[PDB]
Amino acid sequence: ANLLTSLVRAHLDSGPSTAKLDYSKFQELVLPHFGKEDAGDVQQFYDLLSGSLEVIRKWAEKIPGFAELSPADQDLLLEWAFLELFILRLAYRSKPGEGKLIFCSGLVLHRLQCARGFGDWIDSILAFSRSLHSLLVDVPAFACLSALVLITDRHGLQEPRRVEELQNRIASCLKEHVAAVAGASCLSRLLGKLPELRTLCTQGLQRIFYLKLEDLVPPPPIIDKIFMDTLPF
Amino acid sequence: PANLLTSLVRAHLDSGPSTAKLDYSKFQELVLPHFGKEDAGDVQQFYDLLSGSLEVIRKWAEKIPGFAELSPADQDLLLEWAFLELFILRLAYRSKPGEGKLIFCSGLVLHRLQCARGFGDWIDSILAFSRSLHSLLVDVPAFACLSALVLITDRHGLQEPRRVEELQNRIASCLKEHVAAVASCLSRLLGKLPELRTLCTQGLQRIFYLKLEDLVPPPPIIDKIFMDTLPF
Numbered sequence: 001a002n003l004l005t006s007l008v009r010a011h012l013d014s015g016p017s018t019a020k021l022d023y024s025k026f027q028e029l030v031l032p033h034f035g036k037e038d039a040g041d042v043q044q045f046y047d048l049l050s051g052s053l054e055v056i057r058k059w060a061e062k063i064p065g066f067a068e069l070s071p072a073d074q075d076l077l078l079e080w081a082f083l084e085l086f087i088l089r090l091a092y093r094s095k096p097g098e099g100k101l102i103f104c105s106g107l108v109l110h111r112l113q114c115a116r117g118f119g120d121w122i123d124s125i126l127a128f129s130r131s132l133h134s135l136l137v138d139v140p141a142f143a144c145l146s147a148l149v150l151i152t153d154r155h156g157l158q159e160p161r162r163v164e165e166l167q168n169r170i171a172s173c174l175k176e177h178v179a180a181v182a183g184a185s186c187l188s189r190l191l192g193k194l195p196e197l198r199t200l201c202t203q204g205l206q207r208i209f210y211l212k213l214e215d216l217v218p219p220p221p222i223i224d225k226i227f228m229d230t231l232p233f
Numbered sequence: 234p235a236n237l238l239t240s241l242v243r244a245h246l247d248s249g250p251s252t253a254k255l256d257y258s259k260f261q262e263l264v265l266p267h268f269g270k271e272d273a274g275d276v277q278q279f280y281d282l283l284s285g286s287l288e289v290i291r292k293w294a295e296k297i298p299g300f301a302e303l304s305p306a307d308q309d310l311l312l313e314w315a316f317l318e319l320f321i322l323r324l325a326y327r328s329k330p331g332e333g334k335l336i337f338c339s340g341l342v343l344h345r346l347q348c349a350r351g352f353g354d355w356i357d358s359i360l361a362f363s364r365s366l367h368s369l370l371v372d373v374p375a376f377a378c379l380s381a382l383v384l385i386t387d388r389h390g391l392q393e394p395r396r397v398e399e400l401q402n403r404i405a406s407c408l409k410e411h412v413a414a415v416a417s418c419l420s421r422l423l424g425k426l427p428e429l430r431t432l433c434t435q436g437l438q439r440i441f442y443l444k445l446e447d448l449v450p451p452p453p454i455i456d457k458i459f460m461d462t463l464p465f
Contacts, residue, residue, distance in 0.1 A: 202445060209441050212465050213434060233444050 001180075003064060003173045004140055010062035011143040014055050015093060016106030026100075026108045037116040039216045045117035048103055050220050052086045053078075055104045063147050065166045070158050077163070079226045081150040083204045087197065088149060091129035092142060101126070119210070121203045128196050135190055138181065144174035145190075205230070235407050237298055241377035244296035248289055249327060250340030257342050262333075264346045271350040276449040279351035279439075282337055284452055286320045289338045297381050299400045304392045311397070313458050315384045317433040322383060322425075325363035326376055333360070353442070355435045362432055366425060372415070378408035379422060383429065389464070437462070 016022075060078060061067050067074070093102045099111040101122065114122040137145070151167045153160060178184065208227050212219060219227065294300050294312055301308070327336045333345040335356075348356050371379065385401045387394060412419050440459050444451060451459065 202442075205445065206438065206442060210434075210438060213437065213463070215465060231445070232447065233450075 001173065001176065003169060004144070004177055006062065006064050007143040007147055007170070007173065008140050010059050011139065011146065013062070014059035015089070015104055016102070020106045021102065021108055022106040023108050025113075027110060027113060030110065030112045032112060032116050034115060037211075037214075037216070041117040042211055042214075042216045045211070046217070046220055046223060048107075048117075049086065049223050052089075052104050053082055053222065053226075056082065056085050056089075060150060063151070063166075065162075065169070066151070069162060069166075073157050073159055073163065076154055076156055077150050077152070079229050080154050081152070082226050083201045083230075084149055084197065085146060087125055087128070087200050087204065088132075088146060091125055091132050092137070094126060094129045096126045096129040096133070099126070119207050121200070121207050124200055124203060128193070128200055131193050131196060135186065135193070137190065140177050141174060141181075144170055144177065148174070235410075237403065237407050238374055238378070238411060240296070240298050241381055241404070241407070242374050244293050245373065245377040245380065247296070248293035249323070249338055250336070254340045255336065255342055256340045259347075260334075260342045260344060261347060262344050264344075267346065267350070271353075271446075271448070273448045275351035276443055276446075278348075279443070280449070280452055280455055282341075282348075282351075283320060283455055285337060285339050285341075286323070287316070287454060290316065290319050290323075294384055297385070299403070300385065303396060303400070307391050307393055307397065310388055310390060311384055311386070313461050314388045315386070316458050317436045317462075318383050318429050319380060321359055321362070321432050321436065322366075322380055322429055325359055325366050326371070328360070328363050330360045330363040330367065335360075353439050355432075355439050358432055358435055362425075362428060365428075369421060369425070371422060374411050375408060375422060378404055378411065379425070382408070383426065 057078060060074070066077075069077075090101065090103065094100060095102065101109050101111065101114055103109070111122060111126060118125075147170050148167060151163055151170060153163065153167075157163055175184065178186070205227065208219065208223070212224075212227075218224070291312060294308070300311075303311070323338065324335065327338075328334060329336070335343050335345060335348055337343070345356055345360060352359075381404050382401060385397060385404060387397065387401075391397055408422075409419055412422070437459065440451060440455070443449075444456075444459075450456070
């Protein structure tokens with residue numbers, strides 16, 4: 001399974017091992033003033049989004065065939081999938097049974113430590129984490145499903161058939177994996193969680209809208225561009 | 234020289250429904266049933282209720298002495314930037330939060346449950362503000378001044394900001410004197426204005442969400458106020 005192996009490898013290299021989990025800012029209990037934020041909460045919010053986008057862009061460059069799509073198409077796919085991938089990956093790696101968010105750099109933060117920057121959104125992502133975890137999606141299936149989040153039709157693709165071919169290829173790889181484990185239907189079960197995920201993408205845009213309104217610190221330009229480019233209207 | 238106070242009271246009273254003219258024909262305490270998500274009729278109603286205050290507030294403003302002596306561009310700017318705030322403040326003062334009753338400027342009366350789907354959490358925030366405002370027991374003349382102060386205020390991009398400031402001055406003086414005639418109370422009334430700006434923000438959040446959802450688009454005038462008033 002050579003595409004599968006490459007996908008797994010790209011996934012594992014885009015995230016921290018248990019070895020490299022960074023507890024240096026983690027606090028088991030903080031006492032926040034809920035419903036408000038300060039500049040450092042907002043900057044950290046954006047820094048975490050920024051750091052994830054860089055990691056995702058490197059992950060994507062490892063999905064065989066992706067780096068040969070047009071540069072515009074690469075950028076388009078990445079922007080339209082970014083928040084969904086940030087959420088899905090964060091949920092898959094976090095430990096909601098401990099209130100722990102684990103970000104792609106290895107940084108661990110307690111839910112209470114994310115409350116001011118993220119608002120309600122982080123408590124919602126942790127709920128989806130529990131929902132996702134109860135499906136018991138294995139790493140290779142996740143490696144495929146995450147790639148399929150990114151490699152998908154989008155309005156404005158220059159070469160939509162080449163994206164569709166790559167989507168076909170990954171979906172076949174996934175099908176062959178789930179057969180091999182079995183020795184198509186949990187799929188239905190997993191797709192049942194998609195509305196929760198979509199709602200979460202929306203909530204992310206809602207949070208960024210609010211923070212832009214408030215403007216304690218501006219979003220970094222690359223995030224701001226994703227926000228603006230993905231607003232239908 | 235109030236006179237100004239009387240003119241402000243008059244503009245306020247002429248801009249809202251007579252108790253005689255309240256319409257309860259659509260009012261229902263009970264709704265069948267709520268869970269879950271907003272549908273197209275909830276969203277159309279949201280925008281219809283907002284759009285109902287447009288003309289009314291514009292005509293009110295034109296009766297504030299001195300407002301029609303600001304530049305036409307400054308008039309339009311003031312009205313756009315204050316619109317949500319005035320809608321909220323006027324709705325909060327007119328309504329009966331103890332009963333969950335919203336009274337709109339057309340006279341239409343709706344229960345909070347009939348609004349909640351379209352408005353979201355914002356309607357509860359508005360009703361919390363309404364209960365707070367009611368506890369202040371703001372009299373009509375004080376309210377006539379307060380509302381005017383919401384409109385006649387510094388905004389970015391005014392052509393004649395000092396003339397805005399003079400008229401605001403005049404109105405604030407009028408209010409201060411009125412309150413003396415009938416400082417702790419004044420600062421308390423005036424402390425409602427920042428709360429009102431927070432509620433305007435929650436309104437912009439609601440419209441942003443609805444525009445994202447796109448079941449029914451905002452009407453052009455509301456869409457314009459929304460886009461024009463994003464300071465980014």
